[PDB]
Write an enzyme that holds these catalytic residues in place. Structure first.
Site, PDB file in Angstrom:
ATOM      1  N   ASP A 148     -19.608 -29.312 103.313  1.00  0.00           N
ATOM      2  CA  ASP A 148     -19.480 -30.786 103.381  1.00  0.00           C
ATOM      3  C   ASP A 148     -19.066 -31.243 104.800  1.00  0.00           C
ATOM      4  O   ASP A 148     -19.746 -30.901 105.760  1.00  0.00           O
ATOM      5  CB  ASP A 148     -18.522 -31.285 102.284  1.00  0.00           C
ATOM      6  CG  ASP A 148     -18.497 -32.802 102.159  1.00  0.00           C
ATOM      7  OD1 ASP A 148     -19.473 -33.380 101.620  1.00  0.00           O
ATOM      8  OD2 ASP A 148     -17.492 -33.415 102.604  1.00  0.00           O
TER       9      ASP A 148
ATOM     10  N   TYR B 132     -20.724 -45.594  99.507  1.00  0.00           N
ATOM     11  CA  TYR B 132     -19.352 -45.148  99.752  1.00  0.00           C
ATOM     12  C   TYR B 132     -18.967 -45.103 101.233  1.00  0.00           C
ATOM     13  O   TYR B 132     -17.853 -45.482 101.588  1.00  0.00           O
ATOM     14  CB  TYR B 132     -19.033 -43.830  99.023  1.00  0.00           C
ATOM     15  CG  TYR B 132     -19.710 -42.573  99.540  1.00  0.00           C
ATOM     16  CD1 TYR B 132     -18.971 -41.588 100.200  1.00  0.00           C
ATOM     17  CD2 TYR B 132     -21.071 -42.342  99.321  1.00  0.00           C
ATOM     18  CE1 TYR B 132     -19.572 -40.422 100.658  1.00  0.00           C
ATOM     19  CE2 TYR B 132     -21.683 -41.171  99.776  1.00  0.00           C
ATOM     20  CZ  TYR B 132     -20.927 -40.218 100.447  1.00  0.00           C
ATOM     21  OH  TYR B 132     -21.525 -39.059 100.903  1.00  0.00           O
TER      22      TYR B 132
ATOM     23  N   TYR C  65     -14.945 -40.518 108.015  1.00  0.00           N
ATOM     24  CA  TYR C  65     -16.089 -41.412 107.880  1.00  0.00           C
ATOM     25  C   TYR C  65     -15.966 -42.628 108.809  1.00  0.00           C
ATOM     26  O   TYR C  65     -16.963 -43.120 109.326  1.00  0.00           O
ATOM     27  CB  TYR C  65     -16.235 -41.881 106.432  1.00  0.00           C
ATOM     28  CG  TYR C  65     -16.550 -40.777 105.440  1.00  0.00           C
ATOM     29  CD1 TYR C  65     -17.868 -40.364 105.216  1.00  0.00           C
ATOM     30  CD2 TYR C  65     -15.535 -40.155 104.721  1.00  0.00           C
ATOM     31  CE1 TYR C  65     -18.170 -39.362 104.297  1.00  0.00           C
ATOM     32  CE2 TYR C  65     -15.821 -39.148 103.797  1.00  0.00           C
ATOM     33  CZ  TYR C  65     -17.143 -38.759 103.591  1.00  0.00           C
ATOM     34  OH  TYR C  65     -17.424 -37.769 102.679  1.00  0.00           O
TER      35      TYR C  65
ATOM     36  N   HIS D  35     -22.744 -30.601  93.809  1.00  0.00           N
ATOM     37  CA  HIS D  35     -22.170 -30.571  95.163  1.00  0.00           C
ATOM     38  C   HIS D  35     -21.184 -29.407  95.432  1.00  0.00           C
ATOM     39  O   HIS D  35     -21.286 -28.729  96.454  1.00  0.00           O
ATOM     40  CB  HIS D  35     -21.514 -31.926  95.477  1.00  0.00           C
ATOM     41  CG  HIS D  35     -20.892 -32.015  96.841  1.00  0.00           C
ATOM     42  ND1 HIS D  35     -21.610 -32.366  97.963  1.00  0.00           N
ATOM     43  CD2 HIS D  35     -19.614 -31.832  97.254  1.00  0.00           C
ATOM     44  CE1 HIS D  35     -20.803 -32.389  99.013  1.00  0.00           C
ATOM     45  NE2 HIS D  35     -19.588 -32.061  98.611  1.00  0.00           N
TER      46      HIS D  35
END
Length: 320
Positions: free
Chosen positions: A104, A153, A234, A299
Site C-alpha cells: 500500500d 476518500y 494523502y 486488499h
C-alpha cells in the site's frame, strides 16, 4: 525466541521497530491504516527460514513519535524515504543492500526508495500498489477526483481536520473494522456528514481471517494516536507530485516481484490493469519478474492469504 521491540532515532523521529530472527535483513513496510503488526505472519515464516525480519511503525503511526501532525508537508515522499534510508543505516550497518517487502503506502515508499537509492535494495516484493508513472498534466488527488468525484476518500482526506471530525463520533474500532473487512472493487466514498454509510459490507464469513484480538490491536493504537499522522500522507500527494519531477523517465532498476489481490480497489483504477499487464509496468520496472494476482482475495493480502504471501516472499528472495 519472541518478537523484540526497540526504538531507533532516525531523521528527526523516534521510530518503533519490531524484530524477529537472524540472518539477512528483510525490511517490511506497512500501509494505510496499518502498523508493523500487519506483517505478523510473514515475520514468523521468514525468521523460521533463516532471515532477520524488521518491521517499523512509520512516521505518524503507532509508537513512532516526532512528526508534527499540524504540518502535512512534513509527510512528503521525500521525508518518508529519508526515514527509511536513515533506519537502514542505523539497523543494517553491515549490509550495503537489503531485501524490502512493502504494501500500500509502504509500496509507494518502496518504489521511491528504489528510484532514489537503488544502491540500498537488493530485491523488492511490492504488494497492492503498482508503479505509478507521474502524470505530467495533474497530481494523483486531481486525477482520481476527475474519475470518482468529490466524495472519493483521497479527495475528502485533503482538508486538515475534516475527516478526523467525521471519524471522531464513530470511534477507531468501527472505522478500522469497516476498512479491514472491505472487499468491493470500488474506491472508498466519504460523503460529508454520512459516516461509514457509503461503504458496502461483505458477508461476515469472508473476514474470518481477522480475529477480535487482531482488530483490537489496531483499534487500541489508533484510539491513542488518532488518524492524523496516517491521513497526512494523502495530504502530501499534491507536493509529492511537484517534488518528483526530477525522476520523469527514470526506471526502477531493482529486481521486483509484484503481488495484488483480485478485488483490491487499487487494481481496479481505470487503466491500472492495462499498465500492469500490457508492458507499461515492465518498461518503468525492467527487472520486474512475473506479476502475481491472488484469486478471490482483496486488499489486505498479507493477513487474508498469509501462507501464499509468505511463501511468495521466501521463494523470491531465495533466488538471490
Amino acid at each position: 525466541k519472541k518478537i523484540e521491540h526497540k526504538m531507533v532515532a532516525v531523521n528527526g523521529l523516534n521510530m518503533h521497530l519490531a524484530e524477529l530472527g537472524e540472518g539477512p535483513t528483510i525490511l517490511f513496510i506497512h500501509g494505510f491504516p496499518e502498523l508493523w503488526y500487519s506483517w505478523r505472519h510473514q515475520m514468523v515464516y521468514l525468521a523460521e527460514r533463516g532471515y532477520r525480519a524488521v518491521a517499523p511503525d512509520l512516521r505518524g503511526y503507532g509508537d513512532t513519535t516526532g512528526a508534527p501532525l499540524n504540518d502535512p508537508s512534513k509527510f512528503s515522499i521525500l521525508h518518508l524515504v529519508g526515514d527509511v534510508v536513515a533506519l537502514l543505516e542505523a539497523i543494517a550497518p553491515n549490509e550495503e543492500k537489503v531485501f524490502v517487502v512493502a504494501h500500500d503506502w509502504g509500496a509507494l515508499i518502496a518504489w521511491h526508495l528504489c528510484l532514489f537509492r537503488p544502491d540500498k535494495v537488493k530485491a523488492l516484493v511490492n504488494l497492492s500498489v503498482h508503479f505509478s508513472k507521474r502524470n505530467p498534466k495533474m497530481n494523483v488527488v486531481e486525477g482520481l477526483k476527475a474519475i470518482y468525484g468529490e466524495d472519493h476518500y483521497i479527495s475528502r482526506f485533503q482538508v486538515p481536520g475534516e475527516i478526523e471530525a467525521e471519524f471522531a463520533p464513530i470511534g477507531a474500532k468501527s472505522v478500522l473494522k469497516k476498512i479491514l473487512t472491505y472487499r468491493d472493487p470500488a474506491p472508498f466514498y466519504f460523503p460529508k456528514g454520512k459516516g461509514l454509510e457509503a461503504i458496502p459490507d461483505a458477508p461476515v464469513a469472508l473476514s474470518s481471517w481477522l480475529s477480535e484480538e487482531e482488530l483490537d490491536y489496531y483499534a487500541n493504537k489508533f484510539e491513542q494516536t488518532g488518524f492524523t499522522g496516517a491521513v497526512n500522507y494523502y495530504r502530501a500527494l499534491p507536493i509529492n507530485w511537484e517534488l518528483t519531477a526530477p525522476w520523469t523517465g527514470a526506471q526502477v532498476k531493482v529486481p521486483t516481484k509484484f503481488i495484488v489481490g483480485e478485488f483490491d480497489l487499487v487494481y481496479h483504477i481505470p487503466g491500472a490493469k492495462e499498465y500492469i499487464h500490457n508492458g507499461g509496468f515492465k518498461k518503468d520496472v525492467p527487472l520486474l519478474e512475473e506479476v502475481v494476482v491472488l484469486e478471490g482475495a482483496a486488499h489486505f493480502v498479507s493477513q487474508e492469504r498469509p501462507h501464499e504471501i509468505s511463501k511468495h516472499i521466501y521463494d523470491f528472495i531465495q533466488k538471490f
